[PDB]
Amino acid sequence: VKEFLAKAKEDFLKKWENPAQNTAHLDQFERIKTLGTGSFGRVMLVKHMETGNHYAMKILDKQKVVKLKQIEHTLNEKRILQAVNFPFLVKLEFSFKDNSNLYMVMEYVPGGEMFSHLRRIGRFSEPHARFYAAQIVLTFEYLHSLDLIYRDLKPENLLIDQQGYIQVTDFGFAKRVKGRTWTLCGTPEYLAPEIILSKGYNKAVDWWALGVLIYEMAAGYPPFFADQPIQIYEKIVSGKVRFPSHFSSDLKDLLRNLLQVDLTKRFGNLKDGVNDIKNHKWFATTDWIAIYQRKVEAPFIPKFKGPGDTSNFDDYEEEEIRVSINEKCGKEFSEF
Amino acid sequence: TTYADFIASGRTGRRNAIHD
Ligand SMILES: Cc1n[nH]c2ccc(-c3cncc(OC[C@@H](N)Cc4ccccc4)c3)cc12
């Protein structure tokens, strides 16, 4: 594993120091349907016309990004995604910009959102939850070794591919940092205590989010919830979590070690690091190598009708992609 | 039940991230 990481960091660094730019154009793609939306952007199913290859394209409005003060975070997402490579991370295939927007063209994950399936199904069995959790663990092992913090783990950002495996998407809050960072980032339900306590935080927040994710997958609802954010933040600091009775003993134990407010006792952030997780009882049946190699039998396979199918996603109101005659925030996004 | 309280909450839909 150390051999693999050393090699991974070399390839990563090369790309980080010399990032790729404008490797495609908008009119080479056929806009087919909006797959999802958010803050100041939307993701659509697109077809590369010359090849017939389908892709997922995120479109950001430059002015909207500036308005929401996401300039630096956006540049981070662009520079990091073009430099990383892991089977469970969505691969940025092309990126370009025009007078009005920023474009990220990535591998399309036809299976849909984990959020969708979990809400519809209610909750995942422990083995089903364990399967996804293992992919996240390995992904965080990879990302962290590169000094990257993800900061937005949640069902909404995890898509299922054709094989029923996970594809981590949306690196809008990802950042390469050594030491502590301070940005109040994330989604309320998955924020670690340190993020709300202004003392700064490190990679350990991703491990707390993992604990929230495993909890929500196995229970059907988050460990900390309430009508408004402020109510949520308070529960997160009370350091008290209630577990459903159907939770196994090993699962409750792992969770207590993951949702640990004391940063000196939280798993993933200790002396043995990620291994304290990989070797925990709840993961005894998990074959880490087989998972990385994608050879473990997926508990859920969202088969679909040929390429370009969007049946596993919801319906959104379509909107035209506007491109002014005037170049907008040219300077601000010059390196994108 | 906890499930009922969650489903009756306004936070069962896609959750928007917090920026600033
Ligand atoms: C599909 C898909 N396939 N290959 C991708 C690569 C990246 C992304 C992506 C890139 N930025 C942000 C994102 O946000 C996640 C959700 N918050 C919204 C949402 C809900 C359903 C659909 C698309 C988006 C997602 C999506 C895909």
The 3-class SS string of A305-328 reads CCCCCCCCCCCCCCCCCCCCCCCC
Find chain B residues with C-beta within 8 A of A171's C-beta. Answer: none
Q: Reply yes or no on whether A152 is catalytic.
A: yes
The total of other beta-carbon atoms located within 10 Å of residue A123's CB is 18
User: How far does A225 lie from chain B, in Å, by closest CA?
Assistant: 7
> How far is residue A215's CA from residue A154's CA, in Å, rounded to a whole number?
11
**Protein residue closest via CA to atom 14 of ligand 1:** A170
CA separation, residue A242 to residues A5, A223, B14 (Å): 37, 7, 23
Ligand 1 residue neighbourhood (C-beta within 6 Å): A 35-36, 38, 43, 56, 58, 90, 106-109, 113, 156-157, 159, 169-170, 313
CB A8 within 8 A of CB A145: yes
CA separation, residue A228 to residues A193, A225, A240, A301, B13 (Å): 17, 8, 18, 35, 13
B1 touches chain A (CB under 8 A): no
Longest CA–CA span in chain A (Å) reads 62
Closest CA to A95 of A106, A86, A87: A106
Find chain A residues with C-beta within 8 A of B19's C-beta. Answer: 39, 68-70, 185
CB A200 within 8 A of CB A194: yes
Q: Which H/E stretch holds residue A59?
A: strand A53-61
Q: Which candidate from A70, A186, A244 shows the least CB-CB separation from B18?
A: A186
Token pair 């008290």 in the structure block, residue: A240
| A166-169: Cβ within 8 A, 24+ apart | A166/A88, A166/A114, A166/A132, A166/A135, A166/A136, A166/A139, A167/A88, A167/A89, A167/A90, A167/A107, A167/A109, A168/A88, A168/A89, A168/A90, A168/A136, A168/A139, A169/A90, A169/A106, A169/A109
Q: Using DSSP, state whether A107 is helix, strand or coil.
A: strand
> How far is residue A102's CA from residue A327's CA, in Å, rounded to a whole number?
12
Look up residue A263 and give its amino acid.
L
> How open is the CA angle A242-A245-A248, to the nearest 5 degrees?
100
Distance from CA of residue A333 to its chain's centroid?
Answer: 23
Helix axis angle, A249-258 to A204-219, nearest 10°:
150
CB A31 within 8 A of CB A321: yes
Strands of A41-48's sheet in order across: A29-38, A41-48, A53-61, A101-107, A92-97
The size of chain B, in residues, is 20
Find chain A residues with C-beta within 8 A of B2's C-beta. Answer: 221, 242, 244
Q: Using DSSP, state whether A113 is helix, strand or coil.
A: strand
Token pair 């016309």 in the structure block, residue: A49
**Distance from the alpha carbon of residue A227 to the mean position of ligand 1, in angstroms:** 25
Domains located in chain A, CATH noted: 1-18+113-303 (1.10.510.10), 19-112+304-334 (3.30.200.20)
Catalytic residue among A11, A27, A98, A152: A152
Resolution expressed in Å: 2.1
Q: Which candidate from A185, A188, A221 shows the least CB-CB separation from B2?
A: A221
